Design a protein around this ligand. Structure first.
Ligand code: HEM
Lengths: 49, 22, 446, 106, 419, 54, 33, 55, 56
């Protein structure tokens, strides 16, 4: 009964790098964290000014 | 352990902070 | 006198052998009374399409209820009167049927097994009788939080993949499932090379090999055209699935970070890591003095009921984490300690701590192998998993290379800055917000 | 080699014991202890008799302190009666913890 | 390579050893204290004793004990039954010595401290609660207290009213009287006998006769019925089996198996099980049933166990009886006894096909007999059972004082006069 | 008590011409204060503990 | 609590030497037959 | 509770550190300096604000 | 402290057909090229200076 569960289509909300139903996210997502953390480091660097 | 290398980059940050900021 | 190492090297090596079709033969000898012969087929749940999602699992209910040679209850009667036991287990990657039996019973043992795999007399009556049963099993599996939650984990860390489906399969695929469909399933996936015929105990390899009824083979390609991976990677997704039911007395939480395939140097070092965190229950006799913090804290502060760390190992995917059951009001505190134990591990492991876990590993990995059934499953599964090696004596070596810095660097790949897979079956009202569990995997403070 | 010296400390000891006023309050040495984490656990380890005793003693004592009254000369704690009843309990608690600490070196 | 090696000392404690090939060694001191050794005033004491294995003792503090075994990855199991109390101890070849010294403190040097024993107390409830989750345990327990009067009628779990009342002199006394030399049997699965003995000799020499608890046996038919709200109902019907390691007993065992329904096939139904067939035919779709067989030193219990739904309780219960009456009327063909036998034989061998199994089997034998009977011999004995013999035994259940225990909605559960 | 009275002594110096008489006094009071706080008391503590057999 | 609705029930007690043997171990814990 | 002024307002509960609090029996006169300490802080302030009303 | 010479022994004994001065990774390679570059350039620069100083 708890097997007819499906997680909903996230394809609209995810992104290029990790949209590949059949391939690895490990060798994709290395950067994806960089780019988000990049944004942080910049803000915190301008604000510092 | 990892504390030296982490204490050494925390070291550096303070230093560069002061130096610059001050 | 004799010393651990020594013993290790002295252990009966496993003989891997092949039939013409790819039937794999393995066996570990001891010249002992009882024997556990088994056929470890490796076409699981992950090959199923949305419809036949529960196909395989359905076959398993029919495996033991008739062969064209051995009709209605001819299989059981046969096994029974021998005193042999017959078990069928199915995984998301591996189906397996085995027999436990007096060593002198190989003759009619191996015949039976073989028979079972190939000929399965399946009438409309048996199909409609199994349906009802399955539908009733499903209902009963909804009665198990731990099973409900671990499925969820998979579905959410595998959202959008074949691998995320229940091995039990979809409710209504059981209803719908065409009788023709079990055939194609079997026919397409039971063809060795997939299969392995393994066994342990008092038998002579020589005779196993020979005994193998060479009746049907792998009807597949001789070239790369086959090489299109049926084992295609399954996209890794860090999401959570939160199913809150305040009606329930406790809370189950399974939190995971994706991991290595079956074979990898990092994959033993992980284990040594979880040796450290450990596993804990209301009834552990050590409680407050147990050497793993989550346990001690738990034991001490009545933090949780039971908690276990796991390493789920698939060819292209892996689920890593722990799982804790805890009152409605303690979900966050146990989350905190756990994640806390992870981070501490990839930055502050101490040689002492990693050396204790190390040794735990050895034991866990020797003691499992006690008994005939055990050995057989290691040999069978070991062959589709890790290929045709039996890393048993190597282990101690590999386990030996373990260093506090090795453990630290390997743990940091997988846990640190990585995005969790969390699912719970509430009282999850107090379950940490996904971003909170996220920031739990890096160290600013806490 | 302590025969004269260490058989005379008892003389300063004795002096000192009655010097510190707690003698007069009806209290004993063990009840004057700084209640810290080890004492605490020892404390908890006390039998009903020992332990309820330490509660009345301190009750009677803080009562006196509140009223600035000393107990009668006849009812005072005599040095010769040094119930070091916490000592036994208190030692172990420490003993346990020293071990624990030590086991945690490496 | 080398077979076991028993040795009774002047004290009367047995000791065995098998230097095996493989990496894992396991000692296990089996002391002869079961639940049957407590009185009205001492009930629940073994239970607590069982749970208090990691407390401080004379040479090792609760902390060292636990942290120590952890250090090396060892396990310390403390298993008990109505008759015995196996204190198991697993670990790596190299670490037996560190481990053994642990087993010895735990067992010969326990120091039950008012404060430590006291914090345990609450554990008893937690343990009782988790084992009372399987109907089997409360029924099976209810059975033993109905069927006995005095000794084996004592249950393995502490009685609700006793829990916090378990006092430290109780624990100390129980150890002192029962955890003694004459009642002990060392057993090693990967240790040197020569070195084992030495140790045994140095640490296991304590005096204490039997029955300072109040030893003795007695059977009394009786019924314990526990009403519930659960759909399903479990009940046990059992008559004085034959005693332990005797022919009659053995016969029972074989008979047991002719009806005995412990599935040998996953998702599979028994064709062999008479009880199941007979029950089945007169019974509904969903139900399950099996032959129960218990054997102790001075008494046994044989009969069956049923799991039916509310309205079906009787039908199944009688059905099962009627069928076992059949065998007692004489109706039992040779072909089925031999199957049975082979079933049994196969089981006993698989029972001992594991270290843990073997170790239990061996110690077990050392407390009963005084030596190790090899498998083969074992196998011979079971074979000697006559096809008649079985019938005859069976004749005894039907014509032996009844004693039943059930749980659930008991509208439809036969009483003694009902069957 | 002495520290307190040393503290009083110091307060006195405060309103004193900074000349020999007061200098020499203050200097020994400033050492007394830090001794009382840093070294004397701490030792006294120990002693008392040892006389009580603690 | 695990639902016991179907044919699956297969619990009844009876072993060779051990009968109703309750384990309490420093790490694991259980109830067998 | 109902109409227990003190814990009704949450604010007024916070003031029950004065009224309901566990205070040792025995207690030299010395401890009154805490309270007086506050007294002085409040007096300086009222005083200050008036002086700084004409300074 | 650590003691992981065992990891490095393995890393350096690995039969990757690499010369010891490169057997250790990517940094070995950048270090190599930097060194080689500075040397050659320097050598070129020195020849220029000599040609320059040869003249009055
Ligand atoms: C405990 C805290 C304070 C202390 C120790 C303190 C102390 C002093 C002292 C010693 C003087 C010098 C008066 C003289 O000798 O002529 C002074 C002056 C003054 N203070 Fe305060 N004061 C405090 C708080 C305040 C506050 C809160 C205010 C304003 C709200 C304030 C406003 C003034 C003003 C305006 C003067 C100047 C006029 C005068 O000499 O009276 N002070 N204060």
């Amino acid at each position: 009964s708890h097997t007819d569960i499906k997680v909903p289509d996230f394809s609209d909300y995810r992104r290029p790098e990790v949209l590949d139903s059949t391939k690895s996210s490990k060798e994709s997502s290395e950067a994806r964290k960089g780019f988000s953390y990049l944004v942080t480091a910049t803000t915190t660097v301008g604000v510092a000014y | 352990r990892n504390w030296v290398p982490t204490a050494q980059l925390w070291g550096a940050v303070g230093a560069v902070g002061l130096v610059s900021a001050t | 006198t004799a010393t651990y190492a020594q013993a290790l090297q002295s252990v009966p090596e496993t003989q891997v052998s092949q039939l013409d079709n790819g039937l794999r033969v393995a066996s570990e000898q001891s010249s002992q009374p009882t024997c556990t012969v088994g056929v470890w087929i490796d076409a699981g749940s992950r090959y199923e399409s949305e419809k036949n999602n529960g196909a395989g699992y359905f076959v398993e209910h029919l495996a033991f209820k008739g062969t064209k040679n051995r009709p209605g209850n001819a299989l059981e009667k046969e096994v029974e009167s021998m005193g042999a036991h017959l078990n069928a287990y199915s995984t998301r990657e591996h189906t397996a049927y085995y027999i436990k039996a007096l060593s002198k019973d190989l003759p009619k043992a191996v015949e039976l097994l073989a028979d079972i795999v190939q000929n399965c007399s399946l009438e409309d009556s048996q199909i409609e009788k199994e349906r009802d049963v399955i539908l009733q099993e499903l209902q009963e599996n909804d009665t198990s939080m731990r099973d409900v939650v671990f499925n969820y984990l998979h579905a959410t860390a595998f959202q959008g993949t074949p691998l995320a489906q229940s091995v039990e399969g979809p409710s209504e695929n059981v209803r719908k499932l065409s009788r023709a469909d079990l055939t194609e399933y079997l026919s397409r996936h039971y063809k060795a090379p997939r299969m392995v015929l393994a066994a342990a105990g008092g038998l002579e390899h020589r005779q196993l090999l020979d005994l193998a009824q060479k009746h049907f083979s792998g009807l597949s390609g001789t070239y790369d055209e086959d090489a299109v991976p049926t084992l295609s990677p399954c996209r890794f997704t860090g999401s959570q699935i939160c199913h809150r039911e305040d009606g329930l007395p406790l809370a189950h939480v399974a939190i995971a970070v994706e991991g290595p395939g079956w074979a990898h140097p990092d994959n033993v070092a992980l284990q040594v890591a979880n040796a450290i965190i450990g596993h804990y229950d209301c009834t552990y006799g050590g409680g407050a003095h147990l050497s793993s913090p989550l346990a001690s804290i738990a034991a001490t502060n009545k933090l949780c009921q039971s908690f276990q760390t796991f390493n789920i190992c698939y060819a292209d995917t892996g689920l890593l984490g722990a799982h804790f059951v805890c009152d409605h009001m303690s979900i966050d505190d146990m989350m905190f300690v756990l994640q806390g134990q992870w981070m501490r591990l990839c930055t502050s492991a101490t040689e002492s701590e990693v050396l204790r876990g190390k040794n735990l590993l050895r034991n866990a990995l020797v003691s499992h192998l006690d008994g005939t059934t055990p050995v057989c499953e290691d040999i069978g599964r070991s062959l589709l998993t890790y290929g045709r090696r039996i890393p048993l004596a190597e282990w101690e070596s590999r386990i030996a290379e373990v260093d506090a810095r090795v453990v630290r660097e390997v743990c940091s790949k997988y846990f640190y800055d990585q995005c969790p897979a969390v699912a719970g079956f509430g009282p999850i009202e107090q379950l940490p917000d996904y971003n909170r569990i996220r920031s739990g995997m890096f160290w600013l403070r806490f | 080699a302590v025969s004269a010296s260490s058989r005379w400390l008892e003389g300063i000891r004795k002096w000192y014991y009655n010097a510190a006023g707690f003698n007069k309050l009806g209290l004993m040495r063990d009840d004057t202890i700084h209640e810290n984490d080890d004492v605490k656990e020892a404390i908890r380890r006390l039998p009903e008799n020992l332990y309820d005793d330490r509660v009345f003693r301190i009750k009677r004592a803080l009562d006196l302190s509140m009223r600035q009254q000393i107990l009668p000369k006849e009812q005072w704690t005599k040095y010769e009666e040094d119930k070091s009843y916490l000592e036994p309990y208190l030692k172990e608690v420490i003993r346990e913890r020293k071990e624990r600490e030590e086991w945690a070196k490496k | 390579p080398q077979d076991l090696e028993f040795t009774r000392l002047p004290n009367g404690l047995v000791i065995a050893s098998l230097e095996n090939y493989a990496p894992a060694s396991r000692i296990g001191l089996f002391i002869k204290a079961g639940s049957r050794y407590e009185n009205s005033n001492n009930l629940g004491t073994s239970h607590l004793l069982r749970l208090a294995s990691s407390l401080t003792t004379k040479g090792a503090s609760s902390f060292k004990i636990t942290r120590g075994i952890e250090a090396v990855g060892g396990k310390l199991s403390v298993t008990s039954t109505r008759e015995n109390m196996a204190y198991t101890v697993e670990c790596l070849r190299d670490d037996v010595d560190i481990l053994m010294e642990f087993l010895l403190n735990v067992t010969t040097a326990p120091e039950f401290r008012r404060w430590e024993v006291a914090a345990l107390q609450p554990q008893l409830r937690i343990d009782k609660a988790v084992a009372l989750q399987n109907p089997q345990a409360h029924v099976i327990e209810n059975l033993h207290a109905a069927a006995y009067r005095n000794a084996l009628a004592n249950s393995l779990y502490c009685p609700d009213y006793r829990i916090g009342k378990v006092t430290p002199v109780e624990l100390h006394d129980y150890v002192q009287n029962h955890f003694t030399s004459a009642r002990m049997a060392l057993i090693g699965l990967g240790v040197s006998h020569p070195v084992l003995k030495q140790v045994a000799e140095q640490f296991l020499n304590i005096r204490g006769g039997l029955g300072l608890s109040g030893a003795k046996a007695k059977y009394h038919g009786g019924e314990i019925r526990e009403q519930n709200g659960d759909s399903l109902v479990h009940a046990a019907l059992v008559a004085e089996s034959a005693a332990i390691g005797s022919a009659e007993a053995n016969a029972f065992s074989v008979l047991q198996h002719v009806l005995g329904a412990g599935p040998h096939v996953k998702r599979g139904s028994n064709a062999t099980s008479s009880l199941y067939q007979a029950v089945a035919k007169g019974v509904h779709q969903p139900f399950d049933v099996s032959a129960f067989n218990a054997s102790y030193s001075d008494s046994g219990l044989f009969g069956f166990y049923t799991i039916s739904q509310a309205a079906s309780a009787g039908d199944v219960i009688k059905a099962a009886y009627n069928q076992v009456k059949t065998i007692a009327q004489g109706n039992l063909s040779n072909p089925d006894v031999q199957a049975a036998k082979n079933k049994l034989k196969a089981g006993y061998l698989m029972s001992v096909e594991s270290s843990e199994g073997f170790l239990d089997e061996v110690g077990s034998q050392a407390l009963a007999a005084g030596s190790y009977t090899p498998p083969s011999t074992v196998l011979q004995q079971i074979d000697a059972v006559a096809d008649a013999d079985v019938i005859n035994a069976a004749k005894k259940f039907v014509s032996g004082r009844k004693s039943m225990a059930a749980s659930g909605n008991l509208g439809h559960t036969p009483f003694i006069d009902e069957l | 008590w002495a520290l307190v009275a040393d503290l009083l002594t110091l307060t006195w110096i405060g309103g004193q011409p900074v000349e020999h008489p007061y200098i020499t006094i203050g200097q020994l009071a400033s050492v007394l204060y830090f001794l009382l706080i840093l070294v004397l008391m701490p030792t006294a503590g120990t002693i008392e503990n040892k006389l009580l057999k603690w | 609590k695990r639902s016991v609705l179907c044919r699956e029930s297969l619990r009844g007690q009876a072993a060779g030497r051990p009968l109703v043997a309750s384990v309490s171990l420093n790490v694991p814990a259980s109830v067998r037959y | 509770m109902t109409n227990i002024r003190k814990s009704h307002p949450l604010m007024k509960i916070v003031n029950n550190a004065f009224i309901d609090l566990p205070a040792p029996s025995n207690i030299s006169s010395w401890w009154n300096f805490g309270s007086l300490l506050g007294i002085c802080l409040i007096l300086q302030i009222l005083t200050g604000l008036f002086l700084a009303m004409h300074y | 402290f650590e003691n992981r010479v065992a990891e490095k022994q393995k890393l350096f004994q690995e039969d990757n057909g690499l010369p010891v001065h490169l057997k250790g990774g990517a940094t070995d390679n950048i270090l190599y090229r930097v060194t080689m570059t500075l040397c050659l350039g320097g050598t070129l620069y020195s020849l220029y200076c000599l040609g320059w100083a040869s003249f009055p």
